[PDB]
Amino acid sequence: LAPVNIFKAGADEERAETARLTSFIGAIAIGDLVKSTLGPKGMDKILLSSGRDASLMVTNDGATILKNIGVDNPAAKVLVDMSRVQDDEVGDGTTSVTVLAAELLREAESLIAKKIHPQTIIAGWREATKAAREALLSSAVDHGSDEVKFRQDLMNIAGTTLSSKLLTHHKDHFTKLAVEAVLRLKGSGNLEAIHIIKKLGGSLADSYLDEGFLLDKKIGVNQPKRIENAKILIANTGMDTDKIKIFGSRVRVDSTAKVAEIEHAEKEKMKEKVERILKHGINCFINRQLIYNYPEQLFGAAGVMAIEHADFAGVERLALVTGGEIASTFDHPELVKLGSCKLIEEVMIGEDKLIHFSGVALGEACTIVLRGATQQILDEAERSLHDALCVLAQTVKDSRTVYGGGCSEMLMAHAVTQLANRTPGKEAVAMESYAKALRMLPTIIADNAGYDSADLVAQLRAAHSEGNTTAGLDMREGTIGDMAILGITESFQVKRQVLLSAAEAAEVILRVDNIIKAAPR
C-alpha cells in the first residue's frame, strides 16, 4: 500500500488475492448452508427472528431461506438476487442452480490456483454451456395432441414436484387435487384465481378441493340464508352515504323545515337507486364497499341476499366462477347480464361460518381449503402447493417434457466431455470442471439420500457412455433403473433457465477484482 492516504477514514479495499479468497469463501458457505436440503430425502430448517414480532417459519425452499437470512457478502447478495429472480421466473429450481454455481466457483478457484487465465476459463465455460443447451433440445419429448398421455405426464410431474417436500405422505391425493385445480383454469395463466384458505383444525388428510366457491364473509341482518336458484349480480357503487359529487354544494338555508325536506329528498333518492338496482330482477346483491342500515333493510325487505366487504380479488374470483360482470350506473338492464347458481348455503368449517357456492356454470376459478396443526406446517404446505401449481402451469404452457432424475445432467456432462475430447489448448480444463460440477449434483443427491454416491455415479456414467441414455437413480431402494418406467419427469424450460442463470452467475463472479467498500452510515 502507498504511504499517501487516498481513501477516507473507514473504507477498506481488497486487491486480487484477498478479494477472490473472500468471494470463494462466501460462495462455499452459501452453497454448503443449503446443500443439506437438495435431495428428495432432505430435511427442514428453522428461520427464527428477533427484530420483528418473533416470527417462526419452517420451509424447505432455498430461495425463501436465502431471502430471510439476510447475508452481507457481495457475492452472497448476487447469489440471493439470482435465486430470487429464478423463483419469480418459474419458481422450481433454486437450490440446484445455487449448488451448481457454488461448484463452478469452487472449480474456478482451483483453476486459478493452477495458474490459468480467467479468459480461457470463461471461453471454455461458454462453450460447455452452448454444447449443453444444444444437446438438451435434442432430448425433449413433445406432447399436446394425445390428452391421455398428457394427463399422465402432468400427474407424474406433479407427483415428482410434491415428493421433494413435506407432502410425500399425502402425495397420493395432493397430486390429483393440483391436477384437478389446474384443468379448471381452461388454459388461463392467471394464478391469482386460485384462492388458498388455510385453517387450524384437521390434518393433511382432511384437505380437499371444493367444486364450487367459498367465501369468508357475513350476510346482512333479517336476510334469507339458503336461496335456491339465485342470480348473482356483482356491482360497484357507493351505497354508504352516496355523495360522489365533488362539487362545493353546501346547504345554506334558514329553517329546519328545509333541512328536513333535503334529508327526505336524499332518502327518496337512495330508495329510488335501491329500486333501480333491484330492477334487473335479481335476488343476490353483491357490493364492493360497505352497507349501512337503510340499504341493508331495503334489501332485506324484498328477500335479496346482500354481501359486504369484497375487494378486487374476490370480485374477480366471483366473476370468473359465475359469469356476471362488474356493473354500475343501473340504467340499461339488457347490457348487464347475470350469473348462474342453483345451490347457495352456509357451512361450518371448524369454528367459523363460510358461505358455500355450488351449482356453478363456468367455473374458471376455484378455492383450496388447507388444514394443519401448526402454522409452520400450513405455510410449508401452502408454499409446496404454490410451487406445484406454478411448475404445472409452466409445463403446460411449454407443451414439452424432459425426463428428470439426473438424466439431463448426465447427458450434458457427456456432451461437454465429447466436445472437450476434440479440441486442444487450455480450454479442456474449463469443460472438465463444468462436467465435474454437473456430475456432482447426483453425487450430492445420493449422499443426502444415504447410499453409495461414487459407485452409482460411475455406473450411471458408464451406462450413458455405453448407450443407456435414459436411466436415472432409484430413490426407493438405491439402484439404477429406467426413468420411463418409474414415473419421474421434470421440465425443459426450467432446466434451461437454471443452466443459463448458473452460467451467467459463474461468468459474472469469475471476473471480479478490486472490491472497493465505501464508508458505512
Partner 1 sequence: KGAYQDRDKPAQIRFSNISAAKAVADAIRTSLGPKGMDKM
Residue 92 engages Mg ion in binding (rule: CB under 5 A): yes
For residue 8, what is the DSSP state?
Answer: P
Any residues with CB less than 8 A from the CB of 58 and at least 6 apart, and which?
44, 45, 46, 47, 376, 377, 379, 380
For the chain, the helix, strand and coil percentages under 3-state DSSP, each to the nearest 5:
50, 10, 40
Residue 17 engages partner 1 in binding (rule: CB under 8 A): yes
* Contact characters 114-153, partner 1, x per CB under 8 A: -xxx------------------------------------
Q: Are 139 and 410 in contact (CB under 8 A)?
A: no
Rounded Cα gap, residues 120 and 100, in angstroms: 20
CB of 31 to a second copy, least distance (A): 12
Rounded Cα gap, residues 151 and 159, in angstroms: 12
- Classify the phi-psi angles of 297: left when phi > 0, otherwise alpha if psi is within -120 to 50, otherwise beta: alpha
Q: Which of 47, 112, 135, 486 binds partner 1 (CB under 8 A)?
A: 112
272 phi/psi in degrees, rounded to 5: -65, -40
Closest to 434 (Cα-Cα) out of 460, 467, 409: 409
Q: Which is nearer to Mg ion, 92 or 427 (CB)?
A: 92
Residue 207 engages ligand ADP in binding (rule: CB under 6 A): no
CB of 162 to Mg ion, least distance (A): 10
According to DSSP, the residues that pair with 327 across neighbouring strands are 235
Helices (H), 450-482: 453-466
Site for partner 1 in 26-65 (CB under 8 A): 36, 43
> Which listed option, partner 1, ligand ADP, a second copy, none, makes contact with residue 160 (CB within 5 to 8 Å by class)?
ligand ADP
The answer to the question of whether 67 is labelled as a binding residue is no
Rounded Cα gap, residues 318 and 363, in angstroms: 9
Residue 3 engages partner 1 in binding (rule: CB under 8 A): yes
> Please, what is the angle between helix 407-420 and helix 453-466, to 10°?
70
Rounded Cα gap, residues 75 and 28, in angstroms: 11
Site for ligand ADP in 85-104 (CB under 6 A): 92-96
Q: Which is nearer to ligand ADP, 160 or 322 (CB)?
A: 160
Q: Which is nearer to a second copy, 115 or 186 (CB)?
A: 115
CB of 41 to Mg ion, least distance (A): 14
Residue 59 engages ligand ADP in binding (rule: CB under 6 A): no
Residue 450 engages partner 1 in binding (rule: CB under 8 A): yes
Q: Which of 12, 15, 217, 345 binds partner 1 (CB under 8 A)?
A: 15
**Rg of the chain over CA atoms, in angstroms?**
30
Helices (H), 143-255: 147-162, 171-183
CB of 65 to a second copy, least distance (A): 20
CB of 81 to ligand ADP, least distance (A): 16
CB of 426 to Mg ion, least distance (A): 33
The answer to the question of whether 163 is labelled as a binding residue is yes
CA angle 240, 246, 250 (to 5 degrees): 90
The answer to the question of whether 491 is labelled as a binding residue is no
In this structure, the strands spanning 284-286 and 232-234 are parallel
Rounded Cα gap, residues 490 and 484, in angstroms: 12
Rounded Cα gap, residues 109 and 126, in angstroms: 17
Site for ligand ADP in 405-434 (CB under 6 A): 405-406
The answer to the question of whether 129 is labelled as a binding residue is no
In this structure, the strands spanning 305-307 and 141-142 are unpaired
* Contact characters 355-394, ligand ADP, x per CB under 6 A: ----------------------------------------
Q: Are 160 and 171 in contact (CB under 8 A)?
A: no
Q: Which is nearer to ligand ADP, 40 or 224 (CB)?
A: 40
CB of 32 to partner 1, least distance (A): 10
**Residue 18, SS3 per DSSP:** helix
CB of 123 to ligand ADP, least distance (A): 28
CB of 4 to partner 1, least distance (A): 10
Q: Are 181 and 390 in contact (CB under 8 A)?
A: no
Q: Which is nearer to partner 1, 118 or 300 (CB)?
A: 118
Helices (H), 71-168: 74-89, 95-113, 118-138, 147-162
CB of 152 to Mg ion, least distance (A): 21
Q: Which is nearer to partner 1, 112 or 515 (CB)?
A: 112
The answer to the question of whether 495 is labelled as a binding residue is yes
* Binding site residues, ligand ADP, CB under 6 A: 38-40, 92-96, 160-161, 163-164, 404-406, 445, 473, 475, 488
Q: Which residues bind partner 1 (CB under 8 A)?
A: 1-3, 15-17, 36, 43, 112-113, 115-117, 450, 452
Binding residues for ATP: 39, 93-95, 490, 495
Residues in the annotated binding site for Mg(2+): 92
Binding positions for ADP are 39, 93-96, 163-164, 405, 490, 495
